[PDB]
Design a protein around this ligand. Structure first.
Ligand SMILES: Nc1nc2c(ncn2[C@@H]2O[C@H](COP(=O)(O)OP(=O)(O)OP(=O)(O)O)[C@@H](O)[C@H]2O)c(=O)[nH]1
Ligand SMILES: Nc1nc2c(ncn2[C@@H]2O[C@H](COP(=O)(O)OP(=O)(O)O)[C@@H](O)[C@H]2O)c(=O)[nH]1
Ligand SMILES: Cc1cccc(C(=O)N2CCC(C(N)=O)CC2)c1
Ligand SMILES: Cc1cccc(C(=O)N2CCC(C(N)=O)CC2)c1
Ligand SMILES: [Ca+2]
Ligand SMILES: [Ca+2]
Ligand SMILES: [Mg+2]
Ligand SMILES: [Mg+2]
Lengths: 69, 431, 440
C-alpha cells in the first residue's frame, strides 16, 4: 500500500509537470511560427515596393535613351 | 497620443486640405495664430491626434504641404489660417506637373519626393505613437495623382505597419474639361488598390450634382464643391478627434470597414444637405436624418447604393439627440433594407455619436459606406479610359516621360479586376 | 492565507474592475485612500477580506489586483480617478498602441512586448501571499486585448503557476454595445485557446445585462456604467463567500466541486435577484421566496438561453443578507413543485446552498435599490451551449468568405488556427449534447 501511495503522488507530480512542459512548448512553437509569418508578410510587401523603385529607375533610364536620339 | 500625419499634394489636395484645417481648427477652438480659445475640454482631450503643441501653448497642425508649383501653396499661406502651418513644412518645386501623371510620379515628382520625405520623417520622429497618415489629393491632375501616389509608396516603404489613408478626388467632365484626366485617374487607382488601407472616394461628379441639383447653384465653383468636401472630411474624422468608443483610430476603422484588402474604397455621405433658399419649417428629426444619410442624393460618390450591397457601414451622429432614437432608427433602416446588406457579415453597421455638432448645425449625420455599388464609379472611369486608350490618344505625353503602353494596360486590367471583385461579393450568398 | 489575485485585461476588464473594487471598498468599509478604521490589526492579518486586500504598515488596504491594457486611456482614468490612491502605480500597466480589435495583435504583435512585465508584476503580488488560491481574470471576448492578450496571459500563467486555479469573468458580445464586426472571430479564438487553461468561467452576456437594465431598472439606453454596476453586484455575490466569514457561509471552491463534472464543462449560468429600482422597491419588501423564484425566470439570467430546453447538472444558491435556512428550504420546496427542473440521470438533484449574512451594498448614484437580501444562482445547464451556437454561426457566415481574415494573417496567424479553434468549439457543443443524454 505504501508503494501504491508513492506511485499516486509521483503520478500527480508527473502529469502537472508534463502539462506545464506541453504548454510551454506549444507557446514557444506558436510565437516562433507567428514571428516568421509576420516577418515574411512584411518582407513580401517591401519586395514589391522595391520592384516598383526598380521599375521607376527603368522609366527614367528609358526617357534618356529617347531624348538622346 | 496616437498622432496622425497629414499630407496634401497638388492644387486640389492643398485647396481641400486648407479647408479641412480651417474647419477642424474652428471645431477644436484653435484660432489662425494657433492659440486655443475654446470653451469645452472635449476640444483638447485628443487634440494631439492632429496638432503638435509648441512653446507658448501654440498648436501647429501636423501637416505637410506639397506641390510642384508655388501658386496654390502661396495662396494657402495667404489664406485665413495660412500662418498656422509650420513654415518649414512647405515643400514645392517650380516646374509643375502640367496635369501629367508621369511627370508627377516618375520625373518632376521623383526629383522632389526626397525633400518631402525629410519633412515627413521629422514629423514622425516627434510622435509619441504614430498611427499613420492621411493624404488629400486629386486623381485627375499631375502632382496629387502622380506624386501623391509616389509619396504613398515611399512612405509605405519606411512605415510599412502604419495605416495609409487618403481623400482622393475623382475627376468628372462636369467639373474639368482636361482630356487626360481618365488616364491620370486610372493610373492612380492602380496604385491606390495596392498601397492604401482606406480611401475616401470624393467624386467631383457627385459634388457638382449636389451643388446644382440639391443646393440649386447654377454655376458651382470649386469653393462650393470644397464646402461639401470639408464638411465630409470633418464628419469622417470626428471619431478620431473626439473621445469615442467606436472607430476611434485608423486601424480599428480599417478592421471594421475592410473585409478584403483590395476593397478599401469608401463612399462618403452627409446629412442634412439643403440650399440657402429652402426654408426649414421644422427642426430635422432623427428618422429624417437617418433616412437622408442613406439616400443616394446625399452620397459624395456618384453611385446608388441600391444598385449594390453594403459590405460594411460606419455612421456618425453629431449633436445633442436621443441615443435611444438613433439606435431605433439605425435598426429600422437596416431591417427595412436588409436586402442591401450582405448576409454573411453579421452586424456590419456600426454607429458612433459625438456631442459636438458641426459649425452652424444643431445635428448632423456622416456616412461611410463600403458598398459594391462603388463599381459604378470605377466603371465610369474605365469607360472614359478605354475610349481614349483604344485610339492611343495623347499617349506621347506619358511615353515621352519613359512610360510604355504596357503600364497603361496593366492599370486598366487591375481596375477592371477591382470591378469584377466587387460584383463577385455582391452576388455571393450565405447558402 | 487563501489569497486571490484579480487580473483585469482590456477596457471591459478594467472598467468592470473599477466597479468591483469600488463596491468591495464599500462592503468592507475601506476608504478611497485605503484606510479601514474597523481593521485593528495594522499592516497585516488573516481576516476574510485579506483574501482580496493586502495591508501596508501605514494602514493602507491594497487590492490584490493588476490592471493591464495595451493602450493607456482607460487605465489613465484609474490613475487620476477617485480611487487612485488605492493602487500602487506598478499595479496599473499600459502600453501605447492597442490590439485594434484583433486577437492576433493582442496575443502576438503587441501583447508579446508587455507580457513579461505583466508577469513580473503578478509575481510581486504572489510573493506577498502566504497561501495563494488562484487568479480571477476579467476580460471581454470581443476586444483584441480582452481576447488575444488574455489567452496569452492564461497560457503563461499555466506555465508559471502550474495547475493553480484560474477563474474567468468573460464579457460575451452583444450588438447593442459592440465595437467590432470581427468580435465573433476573437471570441472563438480566445475560447479555444483558453479552454484547457481555465478551471471555471462565468460568461456575462452583454445583451442579457442590457435587457435587464432596460426592463428592470427603466434605463432607456444603458451605458457601460449602468451595465458594470449590475455586473459588479453579481461578481460580488460570487466572491462574497471568499471575502466574508459566516457559520452558513459556503466557499466558492466547494460550489465549484459540484459545478464542474468534466474539465471542459466549466461554464456556469449565473442568475441574480432582485434587480429593482428604488421607486419600485419602496414599501415593497422582497422576501426569500420572491427572490428565489426570480432565479428561475430566464429574463434574469446573465446569459441568454433557455434552460427549460436543456438539462441541469448542478444548481447552487448563493444568498446574502437577511436569510435563514428555514425560508430557503420553504422557497425551494415551492419551486420544486411548480417548475420542472430536469437533471441529467447521472447527477444528484439536491440544491446546494450557502448564506453570507453581510447584507448587499449599493454605490451612491446607482440604479439598483438597496435591499435586505439577494441571491445569485449558479447552475450548470446544457442550455448555456446556446451561447456558443450563436457565436459559432456568426463565425461561420464570415469565415466561409474569409472576410476580415487577412487582418489576422497579416499579423502572423494562419487559417489553420481558425479552423482548429472552430473545430474545438464544434466538439464543445457536441460535448454539451453528450452530457445531457441519459445513461444506457
Ligand atoms: N459590460 C461591459 N462591456 C464592455 C465594456 N467595455 C467594453 N465592453 C465590450 O467589450 C467588447 C470590446 O472589447 P474591449 O474590452 O473594449 O477591447 P480591448 O480589450 O480593450 O481590446 P482592444 O481595444 O482591441 O485592444 C465589446 O463587446 C464591448 O461591448 C464595459 O465597460 N462593460
Ligand atoms: N473638389 C475640388 N476639385 C479640384 C480642386 N482643384 C482641382 N480639382 C480637380 O482636380 C483635377 C485637376 O487636378 P489638380 O489638383 O489641379 O492637378 P495637380 O495640381 O497637378 O495635382 C480636376 O479634375 C479638378 O476638377 C478643388 O479645389 N476642389
Ligand atoms: C481532459 C478531459 C478529461 C476528461 C473529460 C474531459 C471533458 O471535458 N469531456 C467533456 C464531456 C464528455 C462526455 N462525458 O460526454 C467527455 C470529455 C476532458
Ligand atoms: C437537512 C439538513 C440537516 C442537517 C444539516 C443540514 C445542513 O446544514 N446542510 C448544509 C447545506 C447542505 C446543502 N444542500 O446546501 C445540506 C446540509 C441540512
Ligand atoms: Ca489587518
Ligand atoms: Ca465528445
Ligand atoms: Mg489644376
Ligand atoms: Mg481597448
Amino acid at each position: 500500500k505504501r508503494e501504491h501511495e508513492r506511485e499516486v503522488i509521483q503520478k500527480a507530480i508527473e502529469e502537472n509537470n508534463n502539462f506545464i512542459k506541453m504548454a510551454k512548448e506549444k507557446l514557444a512553437q506558436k510565437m516562433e511560427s507567428n514571428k516568421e509569418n509576420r516577418e515574411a508578410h512584411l518582407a513580401a510587401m517591401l519586395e514589391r515596393l522595391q520592384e516598383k523603385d526598380k521599375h521607376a529607375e527603368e522609366v527614367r533610364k528609358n526617357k534618356e535613351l529617347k531624348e538622346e536620339a | 497620443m496616437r498622432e496622425i500625419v497629414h499630407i496634401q499634394a497638388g492644387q486640389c489636395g492643398n485647396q481641400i486640405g486648407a479647408k479641412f484645417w480651417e474647419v477642424i481648427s474652428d471645431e477644436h477652438g484653435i484660432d489662425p495664430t494657433g492659440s486655443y480659445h475654446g470653451d469645452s475640454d472635449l476640444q483638447l482631450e485628443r487634440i494631439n491626434v492632429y496638432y503638435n503643441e509648441a512653446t507658448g501653448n501654440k498648436y501647429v497642425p501636423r501637416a505637410i504641404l506639397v506641390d510642384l508649383e508655388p501658386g496654390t501653396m502661396d495662396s494657402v499661406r495667404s489664406g485665413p489660417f495660412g500662418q498656422i502651418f509650420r513654415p518649414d513644412n512647405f515643400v514645392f518645386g517650380q516646374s509643375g506637373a502640367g496635369n501629367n501623371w508621369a511627370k508627377g510620379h516618375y520625373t518632376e515628382g521623383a526629383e522632389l519626393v526626397d525633400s518631402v520625405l525629410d519633412v515627413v520623417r521629422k514629423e514622425s520622429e516627434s510622435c509619441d505613437c504614430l498611427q499613420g497618415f492621411q493624404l488629400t489629393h486629386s486623381l485627375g491632375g499631375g502632382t496629387g495623382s502622380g506624386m501623391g501616389t509616389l509619396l504613398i509608396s515611399k512612405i509605405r516603404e519606411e512605415y510599412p505597419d502604419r495605416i495609409m489613408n487618403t481623400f482622393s478626388v475623382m475627376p468628372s467632365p462636369k467639373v474639368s474639361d482636361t482630356v487626360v484626366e481618365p488616364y491620370n485617374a486610372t493610373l492612380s487607382v492602380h496604385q491606390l488598390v495596392e498601397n492604401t488601407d482606406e480611401t475616401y472616394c470624393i467624386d467631383n461628379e457627385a459634388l457638382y450634382d449636389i451643388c446644382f441639383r440639391t443646393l440649386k447653384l447654377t454655376t458651382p465653383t470649386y469653393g462650393d464643391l470644397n464646402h461639401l468636401v470639408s464638411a465630409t472630411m470633418s464628419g469622417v474624422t470626428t471619431c478620431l478627434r473626439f473621445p469615442g468608443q467606436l472607430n476611434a483610430d485608423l486601424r480599428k476603422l480599417a478592421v471594421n470597414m475592410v473585409p478584403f484588402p483590395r476593397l478599401h474604397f469608401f463612399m462618403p455621405g452627409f446629412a442634412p444637405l439643403t440650399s440657402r433658399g429652402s426654408q426649414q419649417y421644422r427642426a430635422l428629426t432623427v428618422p429624417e436624418l437617418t433616412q437622408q444619410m442613406f439616400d443616394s442624393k446625399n452620397m459624395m460618390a456618384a453611385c446608388d447604393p441600391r444598385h449594390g450591397r453594403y459590405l460594411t457601414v460606419a455612421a456618425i451622429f453629431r449633436g445633442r439627440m436621443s441615443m435611444k432614437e438613433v439606435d431605433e432608427q439605425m435598426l429600422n433602416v437596416q431591417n427595412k433594407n436588409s436586402s442591401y446588406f450582405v448576409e454573411w457579415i453579421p452586424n456590419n453597421v456600426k454607429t458612433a455619436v459625438c456631442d459636438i455638432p458641426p459649425r452652424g448645425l444643431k445635428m448632423s449625420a456622416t456616412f461611410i459606406g463600403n458598398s459594391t455599388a462603388i463599381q459604378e464609379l470605377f466603371k465610369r472611369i474605365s469607360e472614359q479610359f478605354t475610349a481614349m486608350f483604344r485610339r492611343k490618344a495623347f499617349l506621347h505625353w506619358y511615353t515621352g516621360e519613359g512610360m510604355d503602353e504596357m503600364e497603361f494596360t496593366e492599370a486598366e486590367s487591375n481596375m477592371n479586376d477591382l470591378v469584377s471583385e466587387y460584383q463577385q461579393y455582391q452576388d455571393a450568398t450565405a447558402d | 492565507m487563501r489569497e486571490c489575485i484579480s487580473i483585469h485585461v482590456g477596457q471591459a476588464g478594467v472598467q468592470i474592475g473599477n466597479a468591483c473594487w469600488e463596491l468591495y471598498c464599500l462592503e468592507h468599509g475601506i476608504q478611497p485612500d485605503g484606510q479601514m478604521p474597523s481593521d485593528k490589526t495594522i499592516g497585516g492579518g488573516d481576516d476574510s477580506f485579506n483574501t482580496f486586500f493586502s495591508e501596508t504598515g501605514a494602514g493602507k488596504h491594497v487590492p490584490r489586483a493588476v490592471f493591464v491594457d495595451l493602450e493607456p486611456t482607460v487605465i489613465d482614468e484609474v490613475r487620476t480617478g477617485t480611487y487612485r490612491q488605492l493602487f500602487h502605480p506598478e499595479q496599473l500597466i499600459t502600453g501605447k498602441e492597442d490590439a485594434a480589435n484583433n486577437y492576433a495583435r493582442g496575443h502576438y504583435t503587441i501583447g508579446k512586448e508587455i507580457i513579461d512585465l505583466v508577469l513580473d508584476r503578478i509575481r510581486k503580488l504572489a510573493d506577498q501571499c502566504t497561501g495563494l488560491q488562484g487568479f480571477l481574470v476579467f476580460h471581454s471576448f470581443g476586444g483584441g486585448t480582452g481576447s488575444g492578450f488574455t489567452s496569452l496571459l492564461m497560457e503563461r500563467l499555466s506555465v508559471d503557476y502550474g495547475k493553480k486555479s484560474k477563474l474567468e469573468f468573460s464579457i460575451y458580445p452583444a450588438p447593442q454595445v459592440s465595437t467590432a464586426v470581427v468580435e465573433p472571430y476573437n471570441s472563438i479564438l480566445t475560447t479555444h485557446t483558453t479552454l484547457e487553461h481555465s478551471d471555471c468561467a462565468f460568461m456575462v452576456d452583454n445583451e442579457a445585462i442590457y435587457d435587464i437594465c432596460r426592463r428592470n431598472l427603466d434605463i432607456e439606453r444603458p451605458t457601460y456604467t449602468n451595465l458594470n454596476r449590475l455586473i459588479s453586484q453579481i461578481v460580488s455575490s460570487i466572491t462574497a463567500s471568499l471575502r466574508f466569514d459566516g457559520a452558513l457561509n459556503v466557499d466558492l471552491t466547494e460550489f465549484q466541486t459540484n459545478l464542474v463534472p468534466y474539465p471542459r464543462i466549466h461554464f456556469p449560468l449565473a442568475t441574480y435577484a432582485p434587480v429593482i429600482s428604488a421607486e419600485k422597491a419602496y414599501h415593497e419588501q422582497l422576501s426569500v421566496a420572491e427572490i428565489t423564484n426570480a432565479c428561475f425566470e430566464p429574463a434574469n439570467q446573465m446569459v441568454k438561453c433557455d434552460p427549460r430546453h436543456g438539462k441541469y447538472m448542478a444548481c447552487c444558491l448563493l444568498y446574502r443578507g437577511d436569510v435563514v435556512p428555514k425560508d430557503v428550504n420553504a422557497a425551494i420546496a415551492t419551486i420544486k413543485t411548480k417548475r420542472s427542473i430536469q437533471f441529467v440521470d447521472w447527477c444528484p438533484t439536491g440544491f446546494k446552498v450557502g448564506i453570507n449574512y453581510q447584507p448587499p451594498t449599493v454605490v451612491p448614484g446607482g440604479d439598483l435599490a438597496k435591499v435586505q437580501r439577494a441571491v445569485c444562482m449558479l447552475s450548470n445547464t446544457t442550455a448555456i451551449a446556446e451561447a456558443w451556437a450563436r457565436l459559432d454561426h456568426k463565425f461561420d457566415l464570415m469565415y466561409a468568405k474569409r472576410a476580415f481574415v487577412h487582418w489576422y494573417v497579416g499579423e502572423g496567424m494562419e487559417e489553420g488556427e481558425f479552423s482548429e479553434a472552430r473545430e474545438d468549439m464544434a466538439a464543445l457543443e457536441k460535448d454539451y449534447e453528450e452530457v445531457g443524454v441519459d445513461s444506457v
